[PDB]
Amino acid sequence: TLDVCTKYTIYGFKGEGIITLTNSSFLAGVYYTSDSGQLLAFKNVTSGAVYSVTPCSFSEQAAYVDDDIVGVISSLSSSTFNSTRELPGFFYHSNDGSNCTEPVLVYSNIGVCKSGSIGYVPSQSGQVKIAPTVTGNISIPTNFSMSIRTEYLQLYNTPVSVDCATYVCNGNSRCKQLLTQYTAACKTIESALQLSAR
Amino acid sequence: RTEYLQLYNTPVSVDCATYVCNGNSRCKQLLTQYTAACKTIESALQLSARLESVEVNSMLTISEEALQLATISSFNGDGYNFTNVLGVSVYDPARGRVVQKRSFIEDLLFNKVVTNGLGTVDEDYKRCSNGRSVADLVCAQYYSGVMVLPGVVDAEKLHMYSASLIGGMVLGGFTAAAALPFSYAVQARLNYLALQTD
Amino acid sequence: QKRSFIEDLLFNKVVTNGLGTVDEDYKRCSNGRSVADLVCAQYYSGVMVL
Amino acid sequence: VDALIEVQGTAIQRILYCDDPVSQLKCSQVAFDLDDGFYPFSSRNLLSH
Amino acid sequence: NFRRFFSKFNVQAPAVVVLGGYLPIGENQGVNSTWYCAGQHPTASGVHGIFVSHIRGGHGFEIGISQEPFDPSGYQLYLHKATNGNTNATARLRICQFPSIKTLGPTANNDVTIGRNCLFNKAIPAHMSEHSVVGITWDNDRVTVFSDKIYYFYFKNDWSRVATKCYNSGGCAMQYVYEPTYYMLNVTSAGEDGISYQPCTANCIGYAANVFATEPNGHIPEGFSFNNWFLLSNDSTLVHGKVVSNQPLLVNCLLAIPKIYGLGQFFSFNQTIDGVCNGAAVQRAPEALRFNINDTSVILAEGSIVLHTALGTNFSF
Amino acid sequence: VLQRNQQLLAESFNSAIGNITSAFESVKEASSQTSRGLNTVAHALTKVQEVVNSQGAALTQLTVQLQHNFQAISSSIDDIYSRLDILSADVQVDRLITGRLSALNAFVAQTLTKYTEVQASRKLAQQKVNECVKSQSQRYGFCGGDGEHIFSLVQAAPQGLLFLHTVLVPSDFVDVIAIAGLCVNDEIALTLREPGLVLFTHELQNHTATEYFVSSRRMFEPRKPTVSDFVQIESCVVTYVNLTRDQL
Amino acid sequence: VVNSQGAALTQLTVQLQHNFQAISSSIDDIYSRLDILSADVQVDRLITGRLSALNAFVAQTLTKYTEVQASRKLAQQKVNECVKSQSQRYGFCGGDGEH
Ligand SMILES: *[C@@H]1O[C@H](CO[C@@H]2O[C@@H](C)[C@@H](O)[C@@H](O)[C@@H]2O)[C@@H](O[C@@H]2O[C@H](CO)[C@@H](O[C@@H]3O[C@H](CO[C@H]4O[C@H](CO)[C@@H](O)[C@H](O)[C@@H]4O)[C@@H](O)[C@H](O[C@H]4O[C@H](CO)[C@@H](O)[C@H](O)[C@@H]4O)[C@@H]3O)[C@H](O)[C@H]2NC(C)=O)[C@H](O)[C@H]1NC(C)=O
Numbered sequence A: 001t002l003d004v005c006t007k008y009t010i011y012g013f014k015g016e017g018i019i020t021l022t023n024s025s026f027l028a029g030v031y032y033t034s035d036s037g038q039l040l041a042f043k044n045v046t047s048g049a050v051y052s053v054t055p056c057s058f059s060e061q062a063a064y065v066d067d068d069i070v071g072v073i074s075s076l077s078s079s080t081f082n083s084t085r086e087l088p089g090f091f092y093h094s095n096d097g098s099n100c101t102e103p104v105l106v107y108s109n110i111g112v113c114k115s116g117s118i119g120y121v122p123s124q125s126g127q128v129k130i131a132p133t134v135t136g137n138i139s140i141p142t143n144f145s146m147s148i149r150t151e152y153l154q155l156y157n158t159p160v161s162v163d164c165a166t167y168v169c170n171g172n173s174r175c176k177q178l179l180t181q182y183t184a185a186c187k188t189i190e191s192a193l194q195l196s197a198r
Numbered sequence B: 001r002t003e004y005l006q007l008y009n010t011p012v013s014v015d016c017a018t019y020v021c022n023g024n025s026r027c028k029q030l031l032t033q034y035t036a037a038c039k040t041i042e043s044a045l046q047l048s049a050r051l052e053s054v055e056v057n058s059m060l061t062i063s064e065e066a067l068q069l070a071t072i073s074s075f076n077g078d079g080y081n082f083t084n085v086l087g088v089s090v091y092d093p094a095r096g097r098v099v100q101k102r103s104f105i106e107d108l109l110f111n112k113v114v115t116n117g118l119g120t121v122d123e124d125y126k127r128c129s130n131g132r133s134v135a136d137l138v139c140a141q142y143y144s145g146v147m148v149l150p151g152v153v154d155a156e157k158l159h160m161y162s163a164s165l166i167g168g169m170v171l172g173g174f175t176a177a178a179a180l181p182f183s184y185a186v187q188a189r190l191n192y193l194a195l196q197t198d
Numbered sequence C: 001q002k003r004s005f006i007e008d009l010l011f012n013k014v015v016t017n018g019l020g021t022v023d024e025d026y027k028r029c030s031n032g033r034s035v036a037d038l039v040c041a042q043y044y045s046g047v048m049v050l
Numbered sequence D: 001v002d003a004l005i006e007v008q009g010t011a012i013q014r015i016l017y018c019d020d021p022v023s024q025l026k027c028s029q030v031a032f033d034l035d036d037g038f039y040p041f042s043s044r045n046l047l048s049h
Numbered sequence E: 001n002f003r004r005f006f007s008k009f010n011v012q013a014p015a016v017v018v019l020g021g022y023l024p025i026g027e028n029q030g031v032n033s034t035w036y037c038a039g040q041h042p043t044a045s046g047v048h049g050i051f052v053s054h055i056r057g058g059h060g061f062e063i064g065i066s067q068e069p070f071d072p073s074g075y076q077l078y079l080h081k082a083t084n085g086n087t088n089a090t091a092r093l094r095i096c097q098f099p100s101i102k103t104l105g106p107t108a109n110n111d112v113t114i115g116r117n118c119l120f121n122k123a124i125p126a127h128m129s130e131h132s133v134v135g136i137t138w139d140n141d142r143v144t145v146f147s148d149k150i151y152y153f154y155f156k157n158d159w160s161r162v163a164t165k166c167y168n169s170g171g172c173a174m175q176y177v178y179e180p181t182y183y184m185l186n187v188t189s190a191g192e193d194g195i196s197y198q199p200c201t202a203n204c205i206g207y208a209a210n211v212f213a214t215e216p217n218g219h220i221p222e223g224f225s226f227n228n229w230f231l232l233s234n235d236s237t238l239v240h241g242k243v244v245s246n247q248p249l250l251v252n253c254l255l256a257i258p259k260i261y262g263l264g265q266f267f268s269f270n271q272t273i274d275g276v277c278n279g280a281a282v283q284r285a286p287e288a289l290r291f292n293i294n295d296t297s298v299i300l301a302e303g304s305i306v307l308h309t310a311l312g313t314n315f316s317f
Numbered sequence F: 001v002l003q004r005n006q007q008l009l010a011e012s013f014n015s016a017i018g019n020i021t022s023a024f025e026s027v028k029e030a031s032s033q034t035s036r037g038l039n040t041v042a043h044a045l046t047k048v049q050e051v052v053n054s055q056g057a058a059l060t061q062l063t064v065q066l067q068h069n070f071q072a073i074s075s076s077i078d079d080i081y082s083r084l085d086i087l088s089a090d091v092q093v094d095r096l097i098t099g100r101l102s103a104l105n106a107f108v109a110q111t112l113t114k115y116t117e118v119q120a121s122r123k124l125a126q127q128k129v130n131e132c133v134k135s136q137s138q139r140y141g142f143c144g145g146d147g148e149h150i151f152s153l154v155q156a157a158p159q160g161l162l163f164l165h166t167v168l169v170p171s172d173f174v175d176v177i178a179i180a181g182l183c184v185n186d187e188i189a190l191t192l193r194e195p196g197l198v199l200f201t202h203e204l205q206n207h208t209a210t211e212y213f214v215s216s217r218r219m220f221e222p223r224k225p226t227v228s229d230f231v232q233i234e235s236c237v238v239t240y241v242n243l244t245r246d247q248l
Numbered sequence G: 001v002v003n004s005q006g007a008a009l010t011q012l013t014v015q016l017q018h019n020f021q022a023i024s025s026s027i028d029d030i031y032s033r034l035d036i037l038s039a040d041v042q043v044d045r046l047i048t049g050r051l052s053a054l055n056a057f058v059a060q061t062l063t064k065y066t067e068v069q070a071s072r073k074l075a076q077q078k079v080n081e082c083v084k085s086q087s088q089r090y091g092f093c094g095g096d097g098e099h
C-alpha cells in the first residue's frame, strides 16, 4: 500500500509506517538504513522503484498555561486549534491569533502572553555610560538615587561517611574473610573523605 | 594582542518514552514502573535552558546611538581605516529597512573555518516532515526523539552588540552633533596615563 | 540573640523543620520502639553524614 | 484502568486518572499542579486500530 | 429553599444517597454555647458552616477565617465578593497565610509568618438568588463551599475563628450551623428537583460511606472516603507515597443493599450484571466484582460460594 | 552641605527597602522580566532554589544500586548461603561486591569533583566579601555591575552567604560647556594637572558673564578654581583661550 | 572547540544500535516472536542501559555548563574592567605591557 499508514512487513523488517516515493538513482544496492539500524529509503529491482517510509508518529512542543494548554508547536499545518501560523522553523498552534504585547513566557527572542499570542521580543534597553571628552560639552550626572542588587553564593558542603564492609556485609563473618582478597578501594575512599572533611 | 572566549552552548531536547519506545503501547505501560529518573533529567534540561537564557539576556545591552555612529560616514575619519573590521551597511531587504551584515574580518574567518551546511544554519524540520526524498541524520535523530534548540542569540545581534559597545567610546554629550576625533580621546587617555607636555 | 527578620523568614519558607537540615537524635533508632523512616535505615546501611 | 495514586499513612486519597495528554503528563509528572512552560510531547496516534 | 441549595450539584438521574453535614435549620437558630473550637463531642464549636445570601448595605462581602489558638505558621483565608450581580458576584478568594491581625485590620502587631507564597489565589464566580445562599463549611481536612459548584479541598490545619469586615447584616441574614445532621437525599426526576431530602435515621453512615453515583464516564465522584478500599498489590506494603498503576477501578454497573442473592442469584463475566445500576449504565462486560462487607455472619452462616473452572472443576467455600 | 540631599536619598533608600521587603514574599504576583533578570530577587531565589534542590540529591541513587540483584540468584546472600554450597555463591558475591564498589568509586569521584570545584568557587566568594564589603572598591561595576557602589548588606542563607548591593543611581545629566585650555601672553600655558577634575565655563559670553569653575568630570560639583590647582606650560596651541595679565 | 562540540551525540545511536544481551534489538519484532516473560527481561536490560548512558550524558553536559558559567562570569568580568573602561592594573588584560 502506498502513502498510507499501514503495517509494513519487509525483508525481515516489520512495523507500522507511511511509505513515500523518491526518485533517487543507484546502479547497486537495494536497501538503505539509518544510524540506529532502521531502514528509511530503498529501491526495488525490476523497476528501480525507490521508496522512503515514515513513522506514523512525531513529536511536538506544547506550552502549559495557568492550568491548561493554549499553545502548540508542531510541523503539520493541521491542528485541533482554531489557528496555526507558520513561523520560521515551526508551526504555532493556538485559538488566539492576536499579537502578544506583555509576554508572560519568553524563550529566545520570542515570548508568549497570557492570552497565548506569540511575539518577537525587542531587545531591552541597556544602561547608559558617558565617555570622557577633551573639550566642548558634557552631560555630567546629578540628582542620584538608590538601587539594590541581589547576590548569593553557597559556601560549604556537608561531608558523609560510609563503612564499605558494613554497607556490603550485613553481619556475616565468612564474608570478610572471603573478601580479604581485595579491599584497597575501601582505603582510598576513607582516606579521601577523612582528609576532605578535615 | 589576541584573546577569545566562548559564551554559551547548544541545548538538546529528548523525550524519554519516545526515545525508548518507538510507538509501543505494551512497552510504555510496562516501563510505567520506573519514571522518576525521566522527570529529573527533563527538569534539569528545562530548568537549565531557562537559567542560561535569562542571564545572556541580562548580558546583552543596546545603544541605538552607537548604531547611529557605526557607519564610516558616521565616523570622523582620521588617518585610520577600520575598514575590514567595521560592519557593512547593507541595503533595505524585504523588511524594507536598512540593516547591517557582518564586517569583512569575521566573515573571512567564518567562511574559512566555520563550515557552511553545519548545525549553525538552523534547519526547518518541515522539509523532512514532508520527507519525499533522502535526508541526512538530523531527521533520523529527530525520529530517535532528539531536537536541537535554536540559538538563544544571533550573530547580527552580537554584531551590532559588539558594534554598539565599541562605538560607544566616541560619544560626547547626549546626542553629540559630531563625533569627537578619535585622536582627541587618544591624548585624553595619554594624559590620563601620563600628562603629555610636547 | 535570635535571627533578624529576613533570614528566618527565608529559612522557614524554603526549609521546613524535619528536613535533612535539622539535627537528629540517634538514640531512638537504638531504642526503635516505633515505625522507622529512612534516617535510621541508611544508618543501618552504614552511611553517615557528619 | 491506569491512574495516579496517593497513599498517606496507610490511607489513600486523591486518585487521578491519565486519560488526557494533559493528564498523562500530569501523572507523568506525578504532580496535581504542574509548572507553566514548554514541554515536548509526541503525536497521539491511537485514532485507528 | 433547600431545593435550590442542593440542586446545584450534578448527578445521574436515578440516585438516592444519605448525606450528613451541618445542614441549615433556621435563619438565626441561635447557638447553645459560646465556643469556637472543637473537642470531645464537638457540637457547639461556633460556626462549622455559615451560609449568607443577604446584606443590608449591598456594598460587598468581606470574609476572614482563621484559628484563635494562633498557629501563625498555618494558612488564612479572605473572600472579597462584589455584591453587584451574578457575573459580578465573582469573589476574590485567597488561601494564603495572611499578614493579618487578630483584630480585623491593621491596628496592632501583624502576623508575618507568610513564608509560603499561597495555597490558593483565584476569583470564583458566584450568583444571587433569594433562596441561593453562599457559605463555607469545614470538617477535619475537608473544606466544602456552597457557591455555584461545591469546592472541596484537602489540607492539614485548624480553623476555629470566623469573622467578617462586613457585618452589615442581621442575625437571620446568615445561617451558622455547628452540628452535622444527616439526611437521605433521593433524586430520580432527571431534573433540578430531587425526590426528597428526607432526614436519615439508620444505616446513614454506612449508606453515605458506601453509596455513590455511577458517572456516565464511570469515574469516581469526589468526597468518597474509600474507607474499605485498598491498593491492589500482590506483595509488599506502602504506608505512604504516590504511584501510577493499573487497578480494577473502572465500573460497568453498581448495586447496593442486595435483596435477591438468597434465591440462587448467578453472575457471569460475559453478561452485564442486571439490577439497579445506581448512577449511569455501561454496556461493558464485567472484568471484576467488588463487595462490601457489614456482617460476615450471613456469609459464614449461609454464604454459599462456589467457583467454576474452564474444565468444569468447582470449589465450594 | 545643605544636609537635605542625603535626606532626599534616605526616603529613596527607605522606599527601596519597602519594595525589597515586598519582593521577598510572593514573587509571582506581578513579576516582570526587568524585575526578574540578573541582580533580582527572582534570579536570587532561582539560585537558592536550585542549590537547595541540588544538595537534596546524590544519596537516593545509592539506595537504588544496593537494592538491585545483578546476575545472581537473589540479593539475599544468606539465602543462597543457606541454600547452596560455597564456591558458586562466591562467584556471585564477587560480582555483587564488585558492582557496589564500582558504583561508589564513581560516586566518590563525582562528589570530590564537586568538592574541588566548590573549593575554587568558595575561594572566589571569599575575596568578594573582602573587597566589596571589608573595603571600598574603585572598580566600575566589579560588585554587581554598571553602578557606583555605596555599600552592601551581606547576609546568609542555609549553608551560604548573600549580597545586597546598595548602589547610587544617576537620574539627571548636567549639560555644561567645556574649555580646552588657557594661554596667557602667548608665553604661559595654564593647564590641568589631575585628569579627574576638569575646568569649564558655566553659561557663555552673551551678557559678559562667563563662570569659570572646575569640577570632576564624573560628578557635578561646580566651584571656583585656584592657580595652584593648575600647571604651567611653555608651549601653546590654538586650543588655548587667549587672556591678558589683567585678566589673570 | 567547535570540532569538539561537533561530537558527543553520535555515540548515542551507537549503543542504540548495540543489543544488550538479547536476540535482536528490534523490540517490536522480538515482541512479535514468543511469550511475554523473556521479552520483559530483555527490555528492562535495554532501557536501563540507555537511561544510564543519558545519566552519564547529563553529568558531563552539566559539567560543561558548570565550568562555562564560571567562564563567562570571568568573561563578563573582562568586558567590564578594560573593555568598557580603563584600569591601572598593569597587564591584567593582555599582560606583558601597558594597556
Ligand atoms: C456472551 O459471550 C459471547 C462471546 O463471549 C465469549 O463466550 C461466552 C460463552 C463467555 O464465556 C464470554 O465471557 C466470552 O468472552 C458474546 O458474543 C458476542 O457477540 C457475537 C455472538 O454471535 C460475536 O461477535 C461476532 O463478531 C463477528 C466478527 O468477528 C470476526 O468474526 C470472524 C471470525 O473468523 C472474522 O472472519 C470476521 O472478519 C470478524 O473479524 C461477527 O461476524 C458476528 O456476526 C454474527 O455472528 C454470529 C455467527 O453465528 C451470528 O449468529 C450473530 O447473530 C452475528 O450476526 C458477531 O458480531 C462474539 O461472540 C461476541 N462479540 C462481542 C463484540 O462481544 C455474547 O454477546 C455474550 N452475551 C452476553 C449477554 O454478554
Ligand SMILES: *[C@@H]1O[C@H](CO)[C@@H](O[C@@H]2O[C@H](CO)[C@@H](O[C@@H]3O[C@H](CO[C@H]4O[C@H](CO)[C@@H](O)[C@H](O)[C@@H]4O)[C@@H](O)[C@H](O[C@H]4O[C@H](CO)[C@@H](O)[C@H](O)[C@@H]4O)[C@@H]3O)[C@H](O)[C@H]2NC(C)=O)[C@H](O)[C@H]1NC(C)=O
Pocket (backbone or CB within 6 Å): A082, A095, E087
Ligand atoms: C474558533 O473555534 C471555535 C469553535 O470551533 C469558535 O470560537 C468561539 O467563538 C465564539 C464566537 O466567535 C467566542 O465567543 C465569544 O466569547 C467571549 C467571552 O465572553 C464570555 O463571557 C461573557 C460574559 O462576560 C459571556 O456573555 C460570553 O457568552 C462568554 O461566555 C465574548 O466576549 C464574545 O463576545 C461577547 O462579548 C463582547 C465583549 O464583552 C461583546 O461585545 C459581544 O457583544 C458579546 O457579548 C464572544 O461571545 C468564543 O470565545 C470562541 N472560543 C474560542 C476561540 O475558543 C469559533 O467558531 C472559531 N473562531 C473564532 C474566531 O473563535
Ligand SMILES: *[C@@H]1O[C@H](CO)[C@@H](O[C@@H]2O[C@H](CO)[C@@H](O[C@@H]3O[C@H](CO[C@H]4O[C@H](CO)[C@@H](O)[C@H](O)[C@@H]4O)[C@@H](O)[C@H](O[C@H]4O[C@H](CO)[C@@H](O)[C@H](O)[C@@H]4O)[C@@H]3O)[C@H](O)[C@H]2NC(C)=O)[C@H](O)[C@H]1NC(C)=O
Pocket (backbone or CB within 6 Å): E016, E186, E187, E188, E195, E196
Ligand atoms: C426515590 O424516588 C423514587 C421516585 O419516586 C421512588 O420510586 C418510587 O417508589 C415507590 C415505591 O415502590 C413506587 O410506588 C409503587 O410503584 C410500583 C411499581 O410501579 C412503578 O415503578 C415502575 C418501575 O420503576 C414504573 O415503570 C411504573 O410506572 C411505576 O412508577 C407500583 O406497582 C405501586 O402501585 C401498586 O400498589 C398500589 C397500592 O399501593 C396499587 O393501587 C397499584 O395498582 C399497584 O398494584 C406503587 O405505585 C413509585 O412508583 C416509584 N416511582 C416511580 C416514578 O416509579 C423511590 O422509592 C425513592 N427511594 C427512596 C429511598 O426514597
Ligand SMILES: *[C@@H]1O[C@H](CO)[C@@H](O[C@@H]2O[C@H](CO)[C@@H](O[C@@H]3O[C@H](CO[C@H]4O[C@H](CO)[C@@H](O)[C@H](O)[C@@H]4O)[C@@H](O)[C@H](O[C@H]4O[C@H](CO)[C@@H](O)[C@H](O)[C@@H]4O)[C@@H]3O)[C@H](O)[C@H]2NC(C)=O)[C@H](O)[C@H]1NC(C)=O
Pocket (backbone or CB within 6 Å): E232, E233, E234, E235
Ligand atoms: C502480581 O503478580 C501477578 C502474577 O503475575 C500479576 O498478575 C498479572 O496481571 C496481568 C494484568 O492483567 C496479567 O496480564 C494479562 O495476561 C493475560 C494472559 O492471558 C493469556 O494467557 C492465558 C494462559 O495463562 C491464555 O489462556 C490466554 O488465552 C492468553 O493467551 C492477557 O490475556 C491480558 O491481556 C491484556 O491485554 C489485552 C490487550 O492485548 C486486553 O485486551 C486484555 O483485556 C488484558 O488487559 C494481560 O496481558 C498477567 O497475566 C498476570 N500474571 C499472570 C502470571 O497471569 C499481578 O499483576 C502482579 N501485581 C499485582 C499488583 O498483583
Ligand SMILES: *[C@@H]1O[C@H](CO)[C@@H](O[C@@H]2O[C@H](CO)[C@@H](O[C@@H]3O[C@H](CO[C@H]4O[C@H](CO)[C@@H](O)[C@H](O)[C@@H]4O)[C@@H](O)[C@H](O[C@H]4O[C@H](CO)[C@@H](O)[C@H](O)[C@@H]4O)[C@@H]3O)[C@H](O)[C@H]2NC(C)=O)[C@H](O)[C@H]1NC(C)=O
Pocket (backbone or CB within 6 Å): A142, A143, F172, F173
Ligand atoms: C537636579 O536637582 C535640582 C534640585 O532639585 C533641580 O532643580 C530643580 O529643577 C526642577 C525642574 O528640573 C524643579 O522642579 C519643579 O519645580 C516646580 C517649580 O519650580 C520652578 O519650575 C519651573 C521650572 O521649569 C520654573 O519656571 C518656575 O519659575 C519654578 O521656579 C515645582 O512646582 C515642581 O513640583 C511639581 O513637580 C514635581 C515633579 O513632577 C512633583 O514631584 C511635585 O510634587 C510637583 O507636582 C517641580 O518640583 C525644581 O524647582 C528645582 N529645584 C530648585 C531648588 O531650583 C534640577 O533641575 C535637577 N536636574 C535635572 C532635573 O536635570
Ligand SMILES: *[C@@H]1O[C@H](CO)[C@@H](O[C@@H]2O[C@H](CO)[C@@H](O[C@@H]3O[C@H](CO[C@H]4O[C@H](CO)[C@@H](O)[C@H](O)[C@@H]4O)[C@@H](O)[C@H](O[C@H]4O[C@H](CO)[C@@H](O)[C@H](O)[C@@H]4O)[C@@H]3O)[C@H](O)[C@H]2NC(C)=O)[C@H](O)[C@H]1NC(C)=O
Pocket (backbone or CB within 6 Å): A136, A137, A138, B173, B177, B178, F175, F176, F177, F178
Ligand atoms: C556641544 O558640541 C557642539 C558642537 O561642537 C557645540 O556647539 C554647538 O553645536 C550645535 C550643532 O553643531 C549647535 O546647534 C546649532 O543650533 C544653531 C541654531 O541657530 C542659531 O543661530 C541662528 C543664526 O544666528 C539664529 O537665528 C538661531 O535663533 C540660533 O540662535 C545653528 O547653528 C545650527 O542649526 C542651524 O542650522 C541647521 C543646518 O543648516 C538648520 O537645520 C537649523 O534650523 C539651524 O538653522 C545647529 O543646530 C549649538 O548651538 C552649538 N552650541 C552653541 C552654544 O551655539 C556646543 O557648544 C557643545 N555644548 C556645550 C554645552 O558646550
Ligand SMILES: *[C@@H]1O[C@H](CO[C@@H]2O[C@@H](C)[C@@H](O)[C@@H](O)[C@@H]2O)[C@@H](O[C@@H]2O[C@H](CO)[C@@H](O[C@@H]3O[C@H](CO)[C@@H](O)[C@H](O)[C@@H]3O)[C@H](O)[C@H]2NC(C)=O)[C@H](O)[C@H]1NC(C)=O
Pocket (backbone or CB within 6 Å): A097, A098, A099, A100, A118, A119, A120, B093, B094, B095, B096
Ligand atoms: C502583529 O500585527 C501585525 C500588524 O501588521 C503591521 O504590523 C506592524 C509592522 C505595523 O506596521 C502595524 O501598523 C501593521 O498593522 C501583523 O503583521 C505583520 O507584522 C510584522 C511585524 O513587523 C511585519 O513585519 C514584516 O517582517 C518581515 C520579516 O522581518 C519583513 O520582510 C516585512 O517587510 C515586514 O517588515 C509584517 O509586514 C506584517 N504583515 C504580515 C506578516 O503579513 C503580525 O502578523 C502580528 N504578529 C503576531 C505575532 O500576531
Ligand SMILES: *[C@@H]1O[C@H](CO)[C@@H](O[C@@H]2O[C@H](CO)[C@@H](O[C@@H]3O[C@H](CO)[C@@H](O)[C@H](O)[C@@H]3O)[C@H](O)[C@H]2NC(C)=O)[C@H](O)[C@H]1NC(C)=O
Pocket (backbone or CB within 6 Å): B079, B080, B081, B083, B084
Ligand atoms: C583601507 O583598507 C582598504 C581595504 O584594504 C584599502 O583599499 C584597498 O586596499 C587593498 C590592499 O590594502 C588594495 O588591494 C590592491 O589590489 C591590487 C590588485 O590585486 C594589488 O595590485 C595591490 O597591491 C593591492 O593589493 C585595493 O586596491 C584598495 N582599494 C581601494 C579602493 O582603496 C585602503 O587603501 C585602506 N586605506 C587606508 C587609509 O588604510
Ligand SMILES: *[C@@H]1O[C@H](CO)[C@@H](O[C@@H]2O[C@H](CO)[C@@H](O[C@@H]3O[C@H](CO)[C@@H](O)[C@H](O)[C@@H]3O)[C@H](O)[C@H]2NC(C)=O)[C@H](O)[C@H]1NC(C)=O
Pocket (backbone or CB within 6 Å): E106, E107, E108, E109, E110
Ligand atoms: C524602619 O522599619 C521598621 C520596621 O517596619 C518600621 O517600624 C514600623 O513602623 C510602622 C509605622 O509606624 C509600623 O506600622 C504600624 O502599623 C500598625 C498596623 O499594622 C498601626 O496600627 C501602627 O500605628 C503603625 O502604623 C510598624 O508596626 C513598625 N514595625 C516594626 C517592626 O517596628 C520603622 O517605622 C521604619 N523606620 C521609619 C523611620 O519609619
Ligand SMILES: *[C@@H]1O[C@H](CO)[C@@H](O[C@@H]2O[C@H](CO)[C@@H](O[C@@H]3O[C@H](CO)[C@@H](O)[C@H](O)[C@@H]3O)[C@H](O)[C@H]2NC(C)=O)[C@H](O)[C@H]1NC(C)=O
Pocket (backbone or CB within 6 Å): F183, F186, F236, F237, F238, F240, F241, F242
Ligand atoms: C591665541 O594665541 C595663539 C598663539 O599665537 C594663537 O595661535 C595662532 O593662531 C593663528 C590664527 O589661526 C595661527 O595662524 C594660522 O596659521 C595657519 C598655518 O599654520 C593658517 O593655516 C591659518 O589660516 C592661520 O593663519 C597661528 O599659526 C597660531 N600660532 C600658534 C603658535 O598657535 C591663537 O590664534 C590665539 N587665539 C585666537 C582666538 O586668535
Ligand SMILES: *[C@@H]1O[C@H](CO[C@@H]2O[C@@H](C)[C@@H](O)[C@@H](O)[C@@H]2O)[C@@H](O)[C@H](O)[C@H]1NC(C)=O
Pocket (backbone or CB within 6 Å): A022, A023, A024, A025, B132, B133, B134
Ligand atoms: C525527485 O524528482 C526531482 C525532480 O523534480 C521534482 O519532480 C517531482 C518528483 C516533484 O517532486 C516536483 O515538485 C519536482 O520538481 C529530483 O530533483 C529529485 O532528486 C528526485 N528525488 C530523488 C530522491 O532523487
Ligand SMILES: *[C@@H]1O[C@H](CO)[C@@H](O)[C@H](O)[C@H]1NC(C)=O
Pocket (backbone or CB within 6 Å): E060, E082, E083, E084, E088
Ligand atoms: C463589578 O463589581 C465591582 C465592585 O463591585 C465594580 O467595581 C465593577 O464596576 C463591576 N463591574 C460591572 C461590569 O458591573
Ligand SMILES: *[C@@H]1O[C@H](CO)[C@@H](O)[C@H](O)[C@H]1NC(C)=O
Pocket (backbone or CB within 6 Å): E297, E300, E301, E302
Ligand atoms: C457457628 O456458626 C453459625 C453460622 O454462622 C452460627 O450461627 C453459630 O452461632 C455458631 N455456633 C455456635 C455454637 O454459636
Ligand SMILES: *[C@@H]1O[C@H](CO)[C@@H](O)[C@H](O)[C@H]1NC(C)=O
Pocket (backbone or CB within 6 Å): F014, F015, F016, F017, F018, F019, F022
Ligand atoms: C517601589 O517603587 C515604586 C516606584 O517604582 C514606588 O512608587 C513605591 O512607593 C515603592 N514601594 C515602596 C514600598 O516604597
